[PDB]
Symmetry: none
Subunit: 266 residues, 2 copies
């Protein structure tokens, strides 16, 4: 059985699709395979907020559910529904997709089409949270609006910023078009390159090209060319205007305080 | 520093006015303030095409450049120039306005009256695009001719139909404001849903004027919900259909035609 989709973020609606695939495969006595289309079509348009994560991180999460195969957007956008089925679905009896699934040139292929070709299509209903349908777009907007505390309810976890490399650390996220947080300062949970978990204050600013710098707390080693994962816990304050230290000093007090509070709640 | 004008649409010319204000504010280590006049005098005269957007939308765009304040055209058209300066410009050493700037009783107030009061005034030359001077009036006319594809070079973005939601087609209620109407017909649109989701739609403009949109690859009730729609292309003229079957034919072709254009847009990227 094969589920097909982008699964950007692998949010709770996506997990819904993937768990249903596994169950479907169980009762069908078939193997499970996930086809993840590298980029949604909107990805190439100017106003695209950006992906929640890299295709690589994504595959790494999809992989926790089943064999995951990346369908390369450039390699499929021009295929006919038939061409698509023949090349990626030969010998596939069932595909699990979200509602209004589309494929092939001019989004001409749909669940109906797949059915007329003998493939049975399980169309999973979107998960709704707080009267809202879970989806990459919705989550992508919260990231842009800096509403990072509201994300877990839709994403299934905290939005994460990842990459390589008072002092502060510059997180290069890669050449991928990823969504950017609202300019500003955040309280983040920093996963270190050794199971170490610390807290940091993160600034997101320009120079067009949003930057992500993080001041880790109770840390002092050289992280340079090392990877870094940061759970974005809360939006502290909007971006601001050499009294810099003064403000970037209260941020740390604010950090310690929030941190101290989480702890108090035994 | 203060900027003053109607700014219907916040087109690129308006944007040149506003950015200039911010550059001057930065230069002087001062604050910016935008005064947007509710309506141009034409809004109350014969044959006004209508605004490009509501004051409410306008102030939302304006507010991203700086603290904004609306001025009732009626609460100021009667004021004498002096009065205007007396009520709105105290302490202000710089104003940035477009060309043909006017204010006060019988449009007697101008940049000259303002410069002669110690207030420096910077009139920004209209922006020229494709040999034409960018103006709200010019854009209103394109919308009217449905020439929606040529709009962004002037407006700086696609024209928008915005409103409350009144096969299935979502009915957009634009509000009670006097808005410019698109040339009746069928358009391909980019629908911005509440979630923050973007789909494409096929919009129909009929005949007041009716705005109907069928959102593609979408299922859901949208009553009382606000939709913003970028009008991307004019697909075809309105067309009468005697038999009701010829309609579905066309409707079907429309969604189809939309999907093709949508594919073209996506591939135009390379
Ligand atoms: N407490 C810390 N928090 C973040 N980075 C640190 C810390 N201590 C040392 N570093 C390291 O210091 C370097 C950042 O150096 P610096 O030039 O001072 O700042 P930046 O490059 O962000 O402008 C990185 O390689 C980073 O891994
Ligand atoms: N794909 C869609 N496009 C437009 N509206 C849709 C779509 N799917 C569901 N709807 C919903 O259907 C309703 C439109 O209903 P209907 O009365 O049949 O349309 P109309 O009278 O304008 O032809 C709205 O509540 C709308 O949100």
């Amino acid at each position: 059985v094969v589920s097909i989709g982008v699964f950007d973020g692998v949010h709770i609606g996506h997990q819904k699709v993937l768990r249903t695939m596994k169950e479907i495969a169980f009762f069908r006595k078939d193997d499970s395979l996930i086809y993840t289309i590298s980029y949604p079509p909107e990805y190439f348009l100017p106003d695209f907020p950006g992906l929640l994560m890299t295709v690589e991180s994504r595959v790494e999460m999809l992989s926790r559910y089943a064999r995951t195969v990346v369908l390369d957007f450039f390699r499929i956008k021009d295929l006919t529904p038939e061409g698509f089925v023949e090349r990626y679905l030969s010998g596939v009896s069932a595909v699990v997709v979200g509602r209004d699934f589309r494929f092939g040139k001019n989004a001409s292929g749909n669940a109906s089409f797949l059915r007329k070709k003998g493939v049975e299509v399980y169309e999973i209903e979107d998960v709704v949270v707080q009267g809202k349908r879970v989806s990459s777009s919705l989550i992508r907007n919260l990231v842009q609006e800096g509403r990072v505390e509201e994300i877990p309810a839709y994403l299934g976890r905290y939005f994460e910023i990842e990459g390589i490399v008072f002092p502060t650390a510059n997180i290069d996220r890669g050449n991928e078009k990823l969504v950017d947080l609202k300019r500003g300062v955040y309280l983040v949970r920093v996963h270190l390159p050794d199971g170490k978990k610390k807290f940091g204050v993160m600034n997101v600013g320009f120079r067009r090209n949003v930057k992500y710098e993080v001041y880790i707390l109770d840390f002092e080693g050289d992280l340079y060319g090392q990877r870094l994962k940061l759970e974005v816990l809360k939006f502290m304050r909007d971006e601001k205007k050499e009294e810099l230290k003064a403000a970037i000093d209260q941020d740390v007090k604010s950090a310690r305080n929030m941190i101290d509070d989480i702890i108090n709640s035994k």
